[PDB]
Design an enzyme around this catalytic site. Structure first.
Site, PDB file in Angstrom:
ATOM      1  CG  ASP A 285      -1.952   1.292   1.601  1.00 36.87           C
ATOM      2  OD1 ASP A 285      -2.232   1.960   0.871  1.00 36.87           O
ATOM      3  OD2 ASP A 285      -2.568   1.081   2.459  1.00 36.87           O
TER       4      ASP A 285
ATOM      5  CE1 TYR B 115      -4.412  10.627 -13.540  1.00 34.64           C
ATOM      6  CE2 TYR B 115      -4.725  12.060 -15.719  1.00 34.64           C
ATOM      7  CZ  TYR B 115      -4.191  10.997 -14.625  1.00 34.64           C
ATOM      8  OH  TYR B 115      -3.076   9.657 -15.075  1.00 34.64           O
TER       9      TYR B 115
END
Ligand SMILES: C[C@]12CCC(=O)C[C@@H]1CC[C@@H]1[C@@H]2CC[C@]2(C)[C@@H](O)CC[C@@H]12
Ligand SMILES: C[C@]12CCC(=O)C[C@@H]1CC[C@@H]1[C@@H]2CC[C@]2(C)[C@@H](O)CC[C@@H]12
Lengths: 277, 277
Positions: B65, B155
């Protein structure tokens, strides 16, 4: 009647000088909300305000922590005029050092204040601007937003991020009559060694020193007065059709163009390595 | 003996296809650690691995992760060979919508995975590379890292940030013999409406639809096979002196050049607005 301006990060630097420039304008066209993260830092702004003789009621300070969307909303409710004509997104943090010596929290903080903080301000303030079909947003940029600088990896990440954020938004906001511009600043005259050495190798440590030496010399030769930088914000403010980007200096444009016209990055990386080292 | 590769974000897309391309290479030159955030997603990687007949022991999956530096350190300790020859920083999140409709947590997540996540990997892995005086880092980039796209504000912020991060680092890493490159991808064939409408104005909502329509048509006309994109990573990998930036396509380079040679941003914003709307 007046042009209502809300500026973030007014405890020093560009933000402080812009706030008192606007509030002291001989025409009295501006009402300025100078915002600060910690009210204990407000003395410097008030000393400058006195020096320039800002009329009473031309300048007000608000506490605003751009890390906290509640703080953002509380300061927006304090805009008694019920609109913001000019929003200046200027709060920002630097972060200098070998990447592997930077604490994870320091990395996240720089990103949160510099990028997410600006997102929070735009989410809070853009809606009423789009509704009115008018408003100006000015964002403090950096040469480090336009080209990578060694040992500024995370600062540059954050300043590159503001470029992408603002450019993306500008493509959309055009037909709304809301104008957003970046004001691209070079240097402005506004861990300890054992700490950094403990977190990196001796060879990187030495390159860091070299970078610092070069940086200091660029700063002594090239740093601009924040008075001069603040007037570029004013130019953007008053432009009948502003552009996306203003530059406060021609200094770094040759380096930038060399970046710009070799998309592989090879010429830029080589030239900057030679320039610094 | 083998070239040890650790790739992030292998549950789909570029990361999945690159992992099995390398592991299945007829020369058997590569040992691949394909990492994934949730092991429940590993089936697709193993189906592809079988299809390409990766020899046993050429591919291993690790849970990683990139939001958690402990997870990063745990996966690094699982590299039994005790080095990584090629680190591929590919995990990433998209985020699409009107800026004011984006949740604050979603904004912070995209930044954390896409930027801080890559910082965590570089902090973890660069030191041993600098020590050895060798290693290759490949970072998945985007056209949205090179020019702003409407409704991709956050983004694009994140992908612009990777550009500044990597370029800054490359200026330093040059004399260390560690080579970092961005692989700039265009589209790749790898809130609900009521939700978004509730969070924005009708006019922005309509512009969003227009953007989506145009995006879909760009994707249907221009999307590349991840097989073709993965081979550009391979090209970078094998280049005796890699450049900072590789492009997987010539498609967007005219738009990019128009951006590149008007630093005020005025031509780009105009051209992109016309292109989309
Ligand atoms: C970070 C510094 C130095 C300190 C500062 O205030 C920001 C400023 C931005 C311009 C940088 C400069 C360091 C030296 C550089 C990298 C020059 O080589 C060209 C651009 C310069
Ligand atoms: C986001 C999209 C569409 C979906 C995707 O996978 C990423 C990709 C990157 C290229 C973009 C494109 C949307 C349409 C654009 C904006 C074109 O106009 C030029 C570049 C295109």
């Amino acid at each position: 009647a007046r042009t209502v301006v809300l500026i973030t990060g007014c405890s020093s630097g560009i933000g402080l000088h812009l706030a008192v420039r606007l509030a002291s304008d001989p025409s009295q066209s501006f009402k300025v909300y100078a915002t600060l993260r910690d009210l204990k830092t407000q003395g410097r702004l008030w000393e400058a305000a006195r020096a320039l003789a800002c009329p009473p009621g031309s300048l007000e300070t608000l506490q605003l922590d751009v890390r906290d969307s509640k703080s953002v909303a509380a300061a927006r409710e304090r805009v008694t005029e019920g609109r913001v004509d000019v929003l200046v997104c200027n709060a920002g943090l630097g972060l200098l050092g070998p990447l592997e010596a930077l604490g994870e929290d320091a990395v996240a903080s720089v990103l949160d204040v510099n990028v997410v903080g600006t997102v929070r301000m735009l989410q809070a303030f853009l809606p009423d601007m789009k509704r009115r079909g008018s408003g100006r947003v000015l964002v403090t940029g950096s040469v480090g937003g336009l080209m990578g600088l060694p040992f500024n990896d995370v600062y540059c990440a954050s300043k590159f991020a503001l470029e992408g954020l603002c450019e993306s938004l500008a493509v959309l906001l055009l037909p709304f009559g809301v104008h957003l511009s970046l004001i691209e600043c070079g240097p402005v005259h506004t861990g300890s060694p054992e700490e950094v050495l403990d977190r990196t190798d001796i060879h990187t440590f030495h390159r860091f020193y070299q970078y610092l030496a070069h940086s200091k010399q660029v700063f002594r030769e090239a740093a601009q007065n924040p008075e001069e930088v603040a007037e570029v914000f004013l130019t953007a403010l008053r432009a009948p059709k502003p552009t996306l980007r203003y530059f406060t200096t021609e200094r770094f444009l040759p380096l930038l163009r060399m970046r710009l016209d070799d998309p592989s990055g090879s010429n830029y990386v080589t030239a900057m390595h030679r320039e610094v080292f």
